[model samples]
Structures are given as structure tokens and as C-alpha cells.
Target: GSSGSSGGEAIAKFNFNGDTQVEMSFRKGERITLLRQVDENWYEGRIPGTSRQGIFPITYVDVISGPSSG
Candidate 1:
């Protein structure tokens, strides 16, 4: 008999030159699914539970609030 379940982990990496920020958002009933940024460009994804199941789509949006000086 099969329990009909899966399990696994997701990893993401990103690289940046100067400085950058990342943001994410999900709709009601919908989840982030999986998201991670290592440096600025690199990234990975995996299922929260189970062994990498389902095809979750990640919507990325960049917003420029203002400039920063430090």
C-alpha cells in the first residue's frame, strides 16, 4: 500500500555585484511554494513536504522604494 506522500528539501542561491534586495508574495490559498536567493542571481526551489512534488510557479517582482546611502 502507498501512503501517497512525498518529502524533500529546496535550496536557492543568488549573487549580486553592488547591493540588491529580494521580495516575495503569495495570494490567498496559494503559498510561496519554495523560494531562496543565495547571492543575487542564483536560486533554487523544492517542495516543503514530500519528495519534490507538484509544479509550483514562483512570481518574482522587483520594487524600487528609493535610493540608499551608507
Candidate 2:
């Protein structure tokens, strides 16, 4: 039961390539690390080498490579 996907030890990345007006305003082709899942669509993440944490769209980010059999 409850078998689908798994979070990682600082794995996966928020890959978004556009001008988004949010907390951690990132640029296109920038690499963002997935911190935690906020909700069904928003995820709390942090940018590398910075003290910023906010929620981003889950549709824009996903797992890069890991034990994903879903």
C-alpha cells in the first residue's frame, strides 16, 4: 500500500524555463532542487547557494533520476 514514488536526499529538480513571478524567481534553464511537496500543485523548494524557500508548480518540476517505478 501507498506505493508510487519516493522523495530523495536532495534529489530531483524544479526545471522551469520562463519568467515566473514567484518567491524564488529563477531564470530559464536554471536548476532548482526540490525541497518538499507543499500541495497537489505547489512544492516548496530552494535554490542552490541561497537562503530562499517557496512553493512552485508541481507541473513544472519532477524527478530527474531515481528509484521511480511510477
Candidate 3:
């Protein structure tokens, strides 16, 4: 079997302009498909419908839906 789309779906709560190369910027209310939780403060996510992925502060977005097993 193949693992389908994984992780949680989140919505950006505030506009974030990432200043580093490993981080990405997004507008408020943008949908972010989460890839992984980096730690207590950061998470890795991708811009929905695109291949772009980056590390962002977990507080920047709210988890609206996804696997609850975390």
C-alpha cells in the first residue's frame, strides 16, 4: 500500500516573512500542509498544491485538521 497525503492541515494565523534560506514566508490565512513538527517552537510544512517546504514557527499557524495521533 501507498501512504497517501500525510500530516495535518493548518491555516496561517499571521503573516510571516521568513528571513533565512531554510524558512519560507506566507500570508495570513494561507493554508499550510504540515509535514512534521520540528520541535516545541517550529514545524515543517509545505505550501498547499506546491512542492515548496520550509521550517516555520508552530505558533504562526493553527492545526485545523489531520491525524490526531501526534
Candidate 4:
């Protein structure tokens, strides 16, 4: 289901190499806290509880949680 939200938590679907300076490299099965959606194809995320943030393809991950619920 595609939900319209700004941020959320998701798990990586496949390993990605952040070749760009503003990108983040992550392995398969890694969890990340999505900071925000960069576009329809990209999103900004971090390695949960860390300051390491970068842009990655939205296709690389599947949303496990939608937005912040607290």
C-alpha cells in the first residue's frame, strides 16, 4: 500500500552503494529511519539513532512504518 507521508522507518530491499557525496551506503536487511522523501524515486534517511544521513533510492527500501506515531 502506498501511503502519502513525509518520513518513516523502512528496511533495505537490496544493498546499495552510495557513490555520491550526498548518498548513504547500506546493505541488504538494514533498517533506516527515513528523514524525508526527496522525490518520487529518492528519499533521505539515516542509520537510526545516528547522525549519518544521506539520500537513497526509494526503490531500495520498503516502508516498515509510516511516519511518526507517538
RMSD of each: 13.4, 7.7, 4.4, 8.1
TM-score of each: 0.20, 0.51, 0.75, 0.73
lDDT on C-alpha atoms for all candidate structures: 0.30, 0.57, 0.81, 0.82
| Residue 21 of model 2, lDDT score | 37
Cα lDDT for residue 40, candidate 3: 86
What is the number of residue pairs that collide in model 2?
A: 0
Give a tens-digit lDDT track for model 3, residues 1-70.
Answer: 5756668788899998887879977789988878888878888887866567789987789887645765
Model 4 residue runs over 4 Å out of place are 1-6, 66-70
Query: Candidate 1 residues 37-70, lDDT tens each?
Result: 3445433333234233223222232212225855
**Model 3 stretches astray by more than 4 angstroms:** 1-5, 66-70
Residue 15 C-alpha lDDT in model 4: 95
Better of 2 and 4 by lDDT: 4
TM-score ranking, high to low: 3, 4, 2, 1
Deviation (Å) of 37 in candidate 2: 0.1
RMSD of 1: 13.4
Off by over 4 Å in 1: 1-32, 47-70
